């Protein structure tokens, strides 16, 4: 019933689109923010148009790029100016860290020997590429990009937004994570350790984690250390964002804080439900869609 207002970041395609969708069709005033400011207009303006021109007030798109201060300092500038309040942040914005090199399908049977490791529970240390067709490549530029992005530009944003939605009678945060974020991937004994602690967790020890993975992985000491072989920036920077989540979850206790691994339309279901959680919903649970 109350007007509300929400960010999505990383919105204007994939599953953030489908919860900026079914956001704005509750009645919520939704800003999309995207990396790029021509793809979130057009994004805005697909979505106007399928729900009605009655909704072109409920949409608006800002541009935001999470790995940048200045970026996240303007948005915040913007929704203040215009609304002065928010109730809803949906941390999507998202790298992996990974690209395909030749055939870009043999990707799915990298992902498939990682989820595998679900259902054994052995994680494998040594890294096994299925087909000379096509290679993952985790190059170490793009694993300081992954974390910067996957990490830091989900606390900058949090950080930058929290004196807003504190003015909230019922503030929400969503990190929409991923199943690689799961401990079984984590190789690591020790960061595994910081990861799993619930009493005597800190901001700074996580960010021990981060900065000591990123030298091992410059070092080319992935294997030696037993770090993932495969997905590597992308399944530590995610278990950190879950463990980050339950940080900011005892911080807030007036909020509710969750993380979600998520077609596009249903996957977008368990986040979208998790931003109009009821008032007690949990706070610092890791969902896999449906709990």
């Known amino acids: 019933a109350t007007k509300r207002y929400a960010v999505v970041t990383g919105a204007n395609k994939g599953i953030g689109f489908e919860i900026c969708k079914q956001l704005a069709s509750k009645g919520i005033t939704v800003i999309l923010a995207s990396r790029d400011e021509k793809r979130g207009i057009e994004a805005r303006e697909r979505l106007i148009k399928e729900l009605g021109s ?25 929704i203040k100016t215009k609304f002065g309040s928010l109730d809803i942040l949906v941390n999507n914005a998202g790298l992996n860290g990974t690209y395909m090199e030749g055939d870009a399908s043999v990707l799915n049977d990298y992902v498939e020997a990682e989820f595998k490791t679900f259902q054994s529970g052995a994680a494998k240390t040594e890294p096994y590429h299925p087909k000379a067709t096509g290679r993952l490549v985790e190059t170490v530029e793009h694993a300081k990009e992954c974390i910067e992005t996957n990490y830091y530009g989900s606390k900058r944003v949090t950080e930058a937004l929290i004196p807003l939605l504190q003015q909230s009678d019922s503030p929400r945060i969503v990190n929409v994570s991923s199943t690689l974020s799961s401990l079984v991937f984590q190789t690591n004994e020790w960061a595994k350790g910081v990861f799993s602690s619930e009493e005597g967790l800190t901001e700074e020890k996580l960010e021990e984690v981060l900065a000591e993975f990123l030298k091992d992985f410059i070092d080319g000491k992935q294997q030696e250390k037993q770090w993932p072989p495969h997905f590597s920036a992308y399944k530590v920077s995610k278990a950190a964002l879950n ?49």
Do not use: H, M
Not at 260 to 271: G, K, L, S
């Open 54 to 78: 009655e909704f072109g007030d409920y949409v608006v798109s800002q541009q935001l790029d999470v790995a940048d201060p200045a970026s996240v300092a303007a948005l915040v500038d913007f």
């Open 243 to 291: 463990a980050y989540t339950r940080i900011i979850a005892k911080k807030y206790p007036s909020f509710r804080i969750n993380a979600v691994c998520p077609t596009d339309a249903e996957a977008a279901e368990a986040p979208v439900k998790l931003a109009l959680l009821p008032q007690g919903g949990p706070s610092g649970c890791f969902f896999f869609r449906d709990e």
